[PDB]
């Protein structure tokens, strides 16, 4: 009553045709999600401050 009947259990993509493609042969590996937890780059640039001769320490 369960598991049998259909064959679209583990299959998410309908149809096959890699007659041209042939790069990633990994089973179930795409992730069409658009996320990023690397916000150290925007900060890695320092927003131009190291090469800028500007002082802020006043005495």
Curated annotation (Swiss-Prot):
Tissue: Increased expression seen in some liver and prostate cancers. Isoforms lacking the transactivation domain found in striatal neurons of patients with Huntington disease (at protein level).
Stated induction or repression of this protein's expression: Induced in the hours following cyclic mechanical strain in keratinocytes.
Superkingdom, natural source: Eukaryota
Post-translational modification: Phosphorylated by LATS1 and LATS2; leading to cytoplasmic translocation and inactivation. Phosphorylated by ABL1; leading to YAP1 stabilization, enhanced interaction with TP73 and recruitment onto proapoptotic genes; in response to DNA damage.
Location within or outside the cell: Cytoplasm; Nucleus; Cell junction, Tight junction; Cell membrane
Leader sequence segment: none
Domain comment quoted from the record: The first coiled-coil region mediates most of the interaction with TEAD transcription factors.
Record's disease association: Coloboma, ocular, with or without hearing impairment, cleft lip/palate, and/or impaired intellectual development: An autosomal dominant disease characterized by uveal colobomata, microphthalmia, cataract and cleft lip/palate. Considerable variability is observed among patients, uveal colobomata being the most constant feature. Some patients manifest intellectual disability of varying degree and/or sensorineural, mid-frequency hearing loss.
Function noted in UniProt: Transcriptional regulator with dual roles as a coactivator and corepressor. Critical downstream regulatory target in the Hippo signaling pathway, crucial for organ size control and tumor suppression by restricting proliferation and promoting apoptosis. The Hippo signaling pathway core involves a kinase cascade featuring STK3/MST2 and STK4/MST1, along with its regulatory partner SAV1, which phosphorylates and activates LATS1/2 in complex with their regulatory protein, MOB1. This activation leads to the phosphorylation and inactivation of the YAP1 oncoprotein and WWTR1/TAZ.
Subunit structure: Part of a complex when phosphorylated that contains DSG3, PKP1, YAP1 and YWHAG; the complex is required for localization of DSG3 and YAP1 to the cell membrane in keratinocytes. Binds to the SH3 domain of the YES kinase. Binds to WBP1 and WBP2. Binds, in vitro, through the WW1 domain, to neural isoforms of ENAH that contain the PPSY motif. The phosphorylated form interacts with YWHAB. Interacts (via WW domains) with LATS1 (via PPxY motif 2). Interacts with LATS2. Interacts with TEAD1, TEAD2, TEAD3 and TEAD4. Interacts with TP73. Interacts with RUNX1. Interacts with HCK.
Family, per entry: Belongs to the YAP1 family.
Name of the protein described by the UniProt record: Transcriptional coactivator YAP1
Organism: Homo sapiens (Human)
Residue range from the parent sequence: 450 to 504 of 504
């Amino acid at each position: 009553h369960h598991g049998s009947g259909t064959n679209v259990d583990l299959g998410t993509l309908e149809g096959d045709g890699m007659n041209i493609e042939g790069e990633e042969l990994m089973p179930s590996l795409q992730e069409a999600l658009s996320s990023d937890i690397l916000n150290d780059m925007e900060s890695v640039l320092a927003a131009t401050k190291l090469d800028k001769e500007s002082f802020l320490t006043w005495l």
